[PDB]
Every structure is written in C-alpha cells, then in structure tokens.
Structure 1
Amino acid sequence: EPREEAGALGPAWDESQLRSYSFPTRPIPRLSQSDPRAEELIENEEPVVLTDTNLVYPALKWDLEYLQENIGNGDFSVYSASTHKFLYYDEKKMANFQNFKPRSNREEMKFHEFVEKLQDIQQRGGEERLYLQQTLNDTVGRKIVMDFLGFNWNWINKQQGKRGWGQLTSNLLLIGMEGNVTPAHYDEQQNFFAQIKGYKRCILFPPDQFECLYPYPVHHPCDRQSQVDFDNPDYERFPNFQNVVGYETVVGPGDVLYIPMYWWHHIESLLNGGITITVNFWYKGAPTPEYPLKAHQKVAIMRNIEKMLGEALGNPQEVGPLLNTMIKGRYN
C-alpha cells in the first residue's frame, strides 16, 4: 500500500512498479528511531526501517548534476549487465570453477563517462544496464566531504556502541538504473541501508530459510548467492523454495533499512522509477561469546565444514563427492 508524499505530490509508487514473485511476504516494521520497538528489533537482529534518522540528510540533496560536479576526478567501479539481474562474483574464486560463464562486467571509469553511458541509453532506448558499487575514499571534492561530515555520526556511532558491534568496515555508494535487480544473497556483516534518491524494494529472508534458498557452494565464485532464479524458479531442483516466506519493504529518500547479519536480501530499483542512490554502512558484528544454537550459527558452521574439506582434500571439486559419500544410506 503505497505511501502518500507531503503536499499531495501523489502516491510514492504503485504495485505495477514492483516485480511479481511466487512467494508471499510480510511487511518490515517502519519505525521512528526514538521508538523503543525499533531498538528491540535492532538488538534482536530483526530488520526495521527507521524513517527519521537524518543519517544521510545532507545527501538528500544529491542528484546526477550535483554529483558529476563535486565528486572529484577519482576512479569509480562501474558494473555492467546483460539483463535486469546483476549477478556479482568473487574474482579470487574463478580458478576453483573452470567453466564459469560471467554475466556481469566491472569497468573502471570517471563519473562523467558513466553519466554519458547512462544518458545515451536514456536517449537511444537500449536494453543494457549499469550499477555503480564504489566504496567511499579520500578522492572526493570539498563539498562532498562537507556532506559526508554532515551525516548523523552521533546516531550511527551510538548504535554501534550499544550493540557491541565492531568497527565500521566500509561505505558503499550506489547508483543504478530503473528496473535493476540485485539477487538474493547474504552478508556476514550488520548493515544500514540508507536511501537517498529513488525508491527501492527490499525483500528479506531470515537465516533459517537457508534450506529454501539454496546458496551456491562456498567455493563457487557466486558464494553467498542463491541459485534459484526468482523470475523462473525450478521446483524440481529447488523444491523447498515452495516454502519460502519473505519480509518486504519499499525504501525511499531518508528511510534507513537495518539488514541484520546473515539475512538474505533481494533488491529492486522500481520500474519506471528513475535512477537510484543509496549509501550503506557495514559493521563487523559483535564477536561470539549457548544452546539452543541460533540459525546464523548453524550457517557459520556449514561454511566452515565446507572450507576445511577444501584444504584437507586439496581440491574444492571433491567437497561434494565427499559429502555425498558421507550421507548416502548413512544420514538420509
């Protein structure tokens, strides 16, 4: 049910701008940050949209023009795709899987190159799509450093304190095109997804839906991603997908989404929605200290077994045959 923007500027978005999927979804709670319930949620590692942090307030002003202007002259990683879906991958890991067909491409460039590449498609009607996953470092102009300095550190630092989370680990700035999709994957890191321009729809799944979501083997370059194509799910291969239940939200300018450690997420810039900008902050979580075991700990466990079997056997291609040898007629 689309939110209504102030001054009767109309409905923020509508259903037809959302992709359609086979699984059902519940809504993520949208709270104010001084609400206790939002604090409980963050401490319980459940997701929550905070509508009023002002975390990235100075950036709320950013568009394409302002940015080409002040960002500076440094290198920006620009990923490139062949469809709407943007399957990232780990470079170090291609050696493990010899006949691996990459559907994405990283290209370094300068902001304005990107901006033309994008204005071209805007004026010529092309199929191709772009994203800009580029970390934030020192190569940024005066006015952008200003902006950054205007972020709600007090708030974000105090949220780190009270949870015992470790250090801030990076700052991705992201800009992409209407319709773009990032497919379900999970990170091991606590995350604050801070929306700036355009609307994104985030679908999340708790760690304990591990078995309906089918992660690539740990050694595969697509590690941590889900193998199920959401637009076209193969229920013979992935029958437990049929049991998957999401948590959904649409975030827009000002909203901050807490994606907790280990939660799957799947992310779509709305169709017809125009360009998008987001900044996320990633924290490494509080180090481990207790049974029953929490789902994400079982995930941590599986990852390890799979890693070890990789060293021990001398060859990640044998992980699978060894695990099958172990279970057939033994544990299944």
Structure 2
Amino acid sequence: MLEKTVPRLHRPSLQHFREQFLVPGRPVILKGVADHWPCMQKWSLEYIQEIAGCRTVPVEVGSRYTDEEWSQTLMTVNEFISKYIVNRDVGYLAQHQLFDQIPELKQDISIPDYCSLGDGEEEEITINAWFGPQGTISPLHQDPQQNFLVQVMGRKYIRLYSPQESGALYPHDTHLHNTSQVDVENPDLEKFPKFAKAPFLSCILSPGEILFIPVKYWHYVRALDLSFSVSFWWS
C-alpha cells in the first residue's frame, strides 16, 4: 500500500537514465555498473586496516536528529575499528573524503558514466566514505546535490520520500540540508500524524548496487551489517 520497492535496472542507457530518472527526479538502483570495481573483491575489513589503519579520521557519535545531540572525534582507523566494530557502543566513520586523504584507494573505484549528464566538471564531484558497524542510522534528510550511493561491504535499508511530500515529514527547516523531526522506525504518531499516510520507496541495498538519490529527495539509511558505502555528490 504505502510502500513500494525502488526499481532496479541493469546498465540502463545514458539516455534512458536521463529521460526517465534524472530529469523527473525519480530514484532507481543501478546494477552491473559498480559491480566489478576492484573495491568489491578487495575491500575487506582486514584490507582497510592494513592500508588505512594508521590514518586519522573523523568519527561521529550520537543522535544526528538535533545538533547538540551529536559529536565528532578524530582518531586513527585502527582505534575506530577496535572501539566501534570488533567488540559494544555505536560509532560511524561517516561522510569523509577518504579518497583525497588516501589517493591509492581511488584506483579501486570509478566515476559513474552517468555523472557526465550533469553540468559540473568531474573534478568538482565530492566522494565520501561511509563506514561503520550494523546499526548506524543516518536520519531522514535531504542533500543539495544528486547522489550515487554505492554499496561495497554489507547491506543497508534505505527509505525514500519525494520532495513534494515534505509537509508530511515535519522538517526542522532550521538548516537549508533540511532534516526531519520524525524517527522513521519509532515515530510518535500522536506528535506527527500526517506522516502515517505518506508514500515512499524503500530498498535493501547490497554490495555492487548503486542507489541514485535525486537532488533533495529525502533519505533514511540503516546498516544491516558491517557496512562500507561510497557516495558521489554531483550536479
């Protein structure tokens, strides 16, 4: 009823991606694109520690719903892995440009062909690593650019709402990057009534798959396993 699955397409043409997805601002999962990038066979937990273990990175801890509700700390990848993954409490190496810090890792990925349909130059695209244990929640929010979210390790549950459905999501609208006040998986419907009947797409995103999140399409993301994603912001 309220819930449909995000469509999946194998290697759709540039033209079809443009006409049926990019312009109308509709999400889709692309298959058979990021699928043989070397990172898919290579990036084990072990490999990441060997290559990146000693590098310092920002690690996020807390409810990213309000602003005071969270915090970042700078630590080595090795400290992150032992304190937040191997064995207790919740932390997330989120939204970090790891590939500018460690240029060798750039060899293991590619810029999706589909980005050339934008206006922007290729140098202008922002590439982020999202890396953390099962349970990482990134609350419902919009990004000001288009996104290809590429899953490498593990799976993620993602929920998506149209921008035309903003009213029913009760935005803070205290930031542009607007964020929602509703907990998609434990919402007080007394406090947020209109949300109940709001239509959405969802999916479970698996290794090799790419999620296209249109500019300003609302998204919520939860990691079902030990996870590593790579996002591409572009326009």
By the TM > 0.5 criterion, same fold? yes
Aligned to 1:66: 47
| In structure 2, distance between residues paired with 1:112 and 1:49 | 32
Paired residue total: 230
* 1:282 correspondence with 2:214: no
Distance 1:89 1:73, change over 3 A: farther
Gaps of 5+ in 1: 1-22, 91-101, 286-332
* Structure 1 residue 228, shift from structure 2 partner: 1.5
Which residue matches 1:117? 83
Q: Percent identity?
A: 29
3-state DSSP class of the match of 1:148? helix
Deviation string, structure 1 residues 260-295 (Cα, Å, up to 9, x no partner): 00100001111xx3x100000111x3xxxxxxxxxx
Answer yes or no: is 1:180 the counterpart of 2:136: yes
TM-score (ref. length: structure 1): 0.63
What do you get for the CA RMSD once the two structures are aligned?
2.4
The Cα of 1:56 is off from its aligned counterpart by 7.1
Question: TM-score, normalising length from structure 2?
Answer: 0.87
**1:159 aligned to 2:114?**
yes
CA radius of gyration, larger in? 1
Distance 1:185 1:119 in 2: 25
**Unaligned stretches of 5+ residues in structure 2:** none
Could you tell me which residue of structure 1 aligns to residue 8 of structure 2? 30
Deviation of residue 180 (structure 1)?
2.1
SS of 1:261 mapped into structure 2: coil
1:119 CA displacement:
4.6
Structure with the higher strand share, 1 or 2: 2
Residues in 1 aligned to 2:175 and 2:130: alpha-carbon distance in whole angstroms:
27
Q: RCO greater where, 1 or 2, for CA within 8 Å and sep 6 or more?
A: 2
Matched letter for residue 64 of structure 2: L
Aligned to 1:129, the other structure's residue is in SS state: coil
How far is the alpha carbon of 1:28 from its aligned partner? 0.7
Greater Cα shift, 161-170 or 187-196:
161-170
Deviations 1:138-189 (A, max 9, x none): 432xxx61x4224333xx2x42222435554311111111122111111111
Could you say which residue in structure 1 is the equivalent of 2:92? 131
Distance verdict in 2 for CA 1:241–1:188, change over 3 Å: same
Whether the aligned pair in 2 keeps the contact of 1:55 and 1:151 (CA below 8 Å) is: no
2:61 is matched with 80
Q: Distance in 2 between matches of 1:233 and 1:88?
A: 13
